[PDB]
Amino acid sequence: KFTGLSKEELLKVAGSPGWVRTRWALLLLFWLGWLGMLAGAVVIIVRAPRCRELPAQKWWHTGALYRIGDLQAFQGHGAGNLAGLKGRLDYLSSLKVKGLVLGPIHKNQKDDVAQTDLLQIDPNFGSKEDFDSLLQSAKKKSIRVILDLTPNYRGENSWFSTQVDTVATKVKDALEFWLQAGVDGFQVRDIENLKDASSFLAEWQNITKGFSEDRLLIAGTNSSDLQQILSLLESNKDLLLTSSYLSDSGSTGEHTKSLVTQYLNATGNRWCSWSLSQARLLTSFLPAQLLRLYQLMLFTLPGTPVFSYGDEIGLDAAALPGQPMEAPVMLWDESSFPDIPGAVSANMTVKGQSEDPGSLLSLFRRLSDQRSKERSLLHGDFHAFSAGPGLFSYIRHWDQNERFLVVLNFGDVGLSAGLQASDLPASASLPAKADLLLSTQPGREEGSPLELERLKLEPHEGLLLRFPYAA
Amino acid sequence: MQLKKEISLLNGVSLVVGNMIGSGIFVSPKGVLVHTASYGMSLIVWAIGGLFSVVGALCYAELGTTITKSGASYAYILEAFGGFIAFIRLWVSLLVVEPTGQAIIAITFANYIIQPSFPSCDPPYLACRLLAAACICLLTFVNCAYVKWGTRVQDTFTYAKVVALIAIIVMGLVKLCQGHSEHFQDAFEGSSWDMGNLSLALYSALFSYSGWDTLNFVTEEIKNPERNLPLAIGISMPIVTLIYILTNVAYYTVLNISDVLSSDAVAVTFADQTFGMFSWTIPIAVALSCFGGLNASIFASSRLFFVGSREGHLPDLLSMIHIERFTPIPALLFNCTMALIYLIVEDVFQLINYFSFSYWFFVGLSVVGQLYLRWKEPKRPRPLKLSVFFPIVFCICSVFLVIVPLFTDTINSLIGIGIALSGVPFYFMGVYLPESRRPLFIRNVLAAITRGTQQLCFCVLTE
Ligand SMILES: CC(C)C[C@H](N)C(=O)O
């Protein structure tokens, strides 16, 4: 019923000094409080830690690489065919490959050193025009192609000779030729068999860096002693060297740990390459119940994981008969191999494994994605702490993004996964509870928060416990 | 003590544009692209969404010039489909639709003003909430002082955001003419022509144009609404469609799909790529865009609550006006207070899922109310009358847009209906029940505090 105050009446009641003083005071107080809120905001910002710089990566520092022995044995066809890859580029992208290593597509006849020229492509594989078309299609999907420059891939040695190095001059001018063609790097193998190596490596590295900043050279040797490696990695440090250093059958949990940590301590945590061998597949040394172990290991160490073709399905050249083990055939479908039908099963192809969530190729795709998108895995720091008898475990933490933790057992026995470090840095303080992403063998669920003290570990189990940023 | 009809055409163009183009184009233009897997098909779905929203905007021009009352979905629903229904609309937009919009725009402004100092990491939390609260307080003051101040702020910051988008478009199209034409060679390849993907493309390109009726909330203040309202909507639709499509062409030209689909703020990545230095101009441009959007939202919400209380659904008090200034001071203070409460909730960015079914339900209900009024009383004086084509196609489209978020994500839309319906007790027990029957204590204290705040704020209700 009050109907508030009339306009004129209001003007009459508003004459009291109390109300005008209250109005002036409230305006003063509002402005004071707003300025104090700004001051608090700016103070809190200044009392906040500036955070680290991006290490300005290249392309290959991201994701994986993908080797290819023979192009004809790839698609499952007897006709080498760059056009045939047009239907495989997709597949490579399905495996989310950050790079590629074509086989040696140059002409190679026999031990003749002059007749083998690296400037023309073998007609059985294609021509120049479809080659450049492959380059353009790859660049449209961001798959940069490295060309294999080992001269004699149809002989005992790659150089046609252990001693003579005019093939090195052939390498030099082939560099500029194919770089004007559009290749994104080069790779040579059998380095232990080439004499006066370090000089050639230095010169090729220098000219390759002179052409651009993002052109890469990869050397490959079958050495197994840390001393030869360290001697080869003395002059230039952009050299990515693939060796047989990690290939250990026993590979006890404290054996792999020792090997990896010594390899890293020898170089002060620089960049490197992680692969078991130069041209052999993973299964050439391991049983079938450890492939997931290694495929989880090599996708998390600080380096570029080099894979040979066929290891995203667990292809084994010992179960499939009637084929040279160095050049198997990819089992696209059950009929991709025409000879001896029925020998192929559903778990041995790509289609039968695409929809299986607990398959092997699904593990590959998940791991490749998590390694090609998360910063803590791209350039993060590496720290491995001691654990149980036969365990390998480390952490990946960059600055403030989602940390990553892996638990790895190189044992056929079940162990209690006790994680006792007491040496982790302040920004990498291990919490008591973290989530989970996936495991090698089934038995648990994703998204479930697990407490990080009483972890049960079955034989051959790998975990991806993830804990976010904190103090 | 009338509300000055100061609103101008220009000022109207500025409200519609500067409220449409927010951060829906700067930091998340990857709604169409992800469900389309190609480039050309994404541009095409952009254009189609633009066409459908243009038709909707002409439908609202027709309504707004037929009724000529503020509220813009509440006056029409009321005059056409009732006051309880009108009260459901007012209750949902009082409780969850407006305060969350303003809180989130202020928070994003805060996020993007200090980003150049924290480029890779996460900026702190206390500082973000403090800058958001400071922004809301400043704008509610600027708008409680005068109305020409609100319009000068709107003009300035719409000019700023549009000139920044022109910078992006011209630099993109100067890249596309440097001979590259690189990503645009084998377009359309790999598209997903499934129905279950074109539907989601259309839905995500129809959420990108929401806000095409922020000029109807102030119809009672425009100079002469019969000429300045439809001309303002017709002049502010194609500008926004063209800028959206051209900016998308710029993005797709400079970057590729592998990161545009995985980038957290596409404009910032673009700036890091092309502008060698000056990678800090685009974050500040996003901050200005957010500030302007927040100002227009404060404008519209204050006027809506004003009308609501003028109808009796709210306290009798929010219908006041300042004596010497003619600005709805209590309404603006109420809106500011609600937004400054909702800033206190951690992780508000979820609440934009609880009303994505309500909002389009109400827009579609207003359109079908236009159809009902076209049938029932066809002899009102209509200054411009459109063919029933446009209400037809847009009521169809509204059926589509309410049917998408019910099939999927049903529990969220259901709890939304729960919130929206949580207001009927107040109606049935205090509003629909007539005067002089309510308990006298509540009326006494209401009038007492009414006189208190009235004398405190110098406001007598409309003459
Ligand atoms: C509702 C508006 C503030 C949002 C704006 N129309 C956008 O496209 O993001």
Curated annotation (Swiss-Prot), chain A:
Keyword Isomerase assigned: no
Post-translational modification (record): N-glycosylated; N-glycosylation is crucial for trafficking and stability of SLC3A2 to the plasma membrane. Phosphorylation on Ser-247; Ser-249 or Ser-251 and on Ser-368 or Ser-372 by ecto-protein kinases favors heterotypic cell-cell interactions.
Residues listed as glycosylation sites in the UniProt record: N206, N222, N265, N347
Covalent cross-link site, Glycyl lysine isopeptide (Lys-Gly) (interchain with G-Cter in SUMO2): K7
Expression triggers: Expression is induced in resting peripheral blood T-lymphocytes following PHA stimulation. Expression increases at the time of maximal DNA synthesis, in fibroblasts stimulated to divide. Expression and the uptake of leucine is stimulated in mononuclear, cytotrophoblast-like choriocarcinoma cells by combined treatment with PMA and calcium ionophore. Up-regulated in response to hydrogen peroxide. Highly expressed in various cancer types. (Microbial infection) Up-regulated upon hepatitis C virus/HCV infection via NS3-A4 viral protein complex; the up-regulation is mediated by oxidative stress. Up-regulation of the complex formed by SLC3A2 and SLC7A5/LAT1 upon hepatitis C virus/HCV infection.
Organism superkingdom: Eukaryota
GO biological process, one term: phenylalanine transport
Name of this chain's protein: Amino acid transporter heavy chain SLC3A2
Record organism: Homo sapiens (Human)
Positions in the Extracellular compartment: 47-471
Shown stretch of the complete protein: 160 to 630 of 630
Family membership noted in the UniProt record: Belongs to the SLC3A transporter family.
Main location: membrane
Cellular component aspect of the GO annotation: amino acid transport complex; anchoring junction; apical plasma membrane; apical pole of neuron; basal plasma membrane; basolateral plasma membrane; cell surface; extracellular exosome
Subunit structure: Disulfide-linked heterodimer with a non-glycosylated catalytic light subunit (SLC7A5, SLC7A6, SLC7A7, SLC7A8, SLC7A10 or SLC7A11). Interacts with TLCD3A/CT120. Interacts with ICAM1. Constitutively and specifically associates with beta-1 integrins (alpha-2/beta-1, alpha-3/beta-1, alpha-5/beta-1 and alpha-6/beta-1), but minimally with alpha-4/beta-1. Interacts with LAPTM4B; recruits SLC3A2 and SLC7A5/LAT1 to lysosomes to promote leucine uptake into these organelles and is required for mTORC1 activation. (Microbial infection) Interacts with hepatitis C virus/HCV envelope glycoprotein E2; the interaction may facilitate viral entry into host cell.
Swiss-Prot record, chain B:
One GO BP annotation of this record: ornithine transport
Keywords: Amino-acid transport, Antiport, Cell membrane, Disulfide bond, Membrane, Phosphoprotein, Transmembrane, Transmembrane helix, Transport
A GO cellular component annotation in the UniProt record: plasma membrane
Residue spans crossing the bilayer: 7-27, 41-61, 77-97, 130-150, 157-177, 198-218, 229-249, 274-294, 326-346, 348-368, 388-408, 414-434
Locations listed in the record: Cell membrane
Tissue expression as described in the entry: Expressed in normal fibroblasts and those from LPI patients. Also expressed in HUVECs, monocytes, RPE cells, and various carcinoma cell lines. Expressed in brain, heart, testis, kidney, small intestine and parotis. Highly expressed in T lymphocytes.
A molecular function GO annotation: basic amino acid transmembrane transporter activity
Pfam families: AA_permease_2
Membrane topology, from the record: Multi-pass membrane protein
Catalyses which reaction(s): L-lysine(out) + L-arginine(in) = L-lysine(in) + L-arginine(out); L-leucine(out) + L-arginine(in) + Na(+)(out) = L-leucine(in) + L-arginine(out) + Na(+)(in); L-glutamine(out) + L-arginine(in) + Na(+)(out) = L-glutamine(in) + L-arginine(out) + Na(+)(in); L-histidine(out) + L-arginine(in) + Na(+)(out) = L-histidine(in) + L-arginine(out) + Na(+)(in)
Regulation affecting activity: Arginine transport is strongly inhibited by lysine, glutamate, leucine, glutamine, methionine and histidine, in the presence of Na(+). Also inhibited by protein kinase C (PKC) and treatment with phorbol-12-myristate-13-acetate (PMA).
Residue intervals on the Extracellular side: 28-40, 98-129, 178-197, 250-273, 347, 409-413
Cytoplasmic topological domain residue ranges: 62-76, 151-156, 219-228, 295-325, 369-387, 435-463
Complexes and interactors: Disulfide-linked heterodimer with the amino acid transport protein SLC3A2/4F2hc.
Protein task: Heterodimer with SLC3A2, that functions as an antiporter which operates as an efflux route by exporting cationic amino acids such as L-arginine from inside the cells in exchange with neutral amino acids like L-leucine, L-glutamine and isoleucine, plus sodium ions and may participate in nitric oxide synthesis. Also exchanges L-arginine with L-lysine in a sodium-independent manner. The transport mechanism is electroneutral and operates with a stoichiometry of 1:1.
Family: Belongs to the amino acid-polyamine-organocation (APC) superfamily. L-type amino acid transporter (LAT) (TC 2.A.3.8) family.
The name this protein goes by in its record: Y+L amino acid transporter 2
